[PDB]
Design a protein around this ligand. Sequence first.
Ligand SMILES: C[C@]12CCC(=O)C[C@@H]1CC[C@@H]1[C@@H]2CC[C@]2(C)[C@@H](O)CC[C@@H]12
Ligand SMILES: O=C(O)c1ccccc1Nc1cccc(C(F)(F)F)c1
Length: 248
Amino acid sequence: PIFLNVLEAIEPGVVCAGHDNNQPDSFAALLSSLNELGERQLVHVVKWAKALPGFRNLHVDDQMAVIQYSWMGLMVFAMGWRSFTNVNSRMLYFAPDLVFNEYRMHKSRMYSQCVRMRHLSQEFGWLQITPQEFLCMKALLLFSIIPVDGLKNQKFFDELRMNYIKELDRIIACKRKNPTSCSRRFYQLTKLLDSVQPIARELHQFTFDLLIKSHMVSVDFPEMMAEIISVQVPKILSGKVKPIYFHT
Ligand SMILES: C[C@]12CCC(=O)C[C@@H]1CC[C@@H]1[C@@H]2CC[C@]2(C)[C@@H](O)CC[C@@H]12
Ligand SMILES: O=C(O)c1ccccc1Nc1cccc(C(F)(F)F)c1
């Protein structure tokens, strides 16, 4: 249908991190590249979102808010997809010029977090997620985290989230036969989406601390990345902004 054409048509393309693979691996270089990749990946997310159906309805402030709160969850989820479709979850495919292997996962000083990411990446396979399901879930991640005191126009956001959830159902109801698996498939995806939040929160904490002592470890932080991680992120780790789980 129309909805599906849009999502597949506004799906961001390949994005390099600009990492110089000629130089030996070093924490500084690796994380600095990831930050640069983040800044780059953020530009596409902004445009990707503005081109999203009904997104232009939210108040301009809520448009930037939701983007500054779930950018981590979106990029991680998408990255997990590339890893599955490119290297079959064997490694973390952040970018064509920035693939993480067992070694780099250790050199990045965040091996545990990578494990969970390589785990999310494998879920796409264990559950046999389809392209249509992936695209629909990613968009729903954009509307998966908001401040406890709601947004400027919560009503509009709830209906916007409600409608995207409906699209997921239709996508799911376009290949099933009996309800035994139908209403069941919904349970699987809803779980997968929720498993993303925990991972995202761990990375949030990590980038935060890394930013605090960025000068001592010589890790560069792009302008935008620096403002969001110091102004937006803190609100999440403080409890002001909490994700939206389907299950408890
Ligand atoms: C979102 C990015 C970059 C885009 C992506 O593919 C997922 C990946 C997950 C780890 C993030 C990284 C951006 C830079 C961060 C936030 C580092 O500071 C620490 C964790 C890194
Ligand atoms: O377009 C609006 O008026 C709208 C308003 C609030 C929430 C969602 C909205 N539209 C919307 C929301 C999800 C999916 C689709 C569609 F699939 F039709 F494109 C349209």
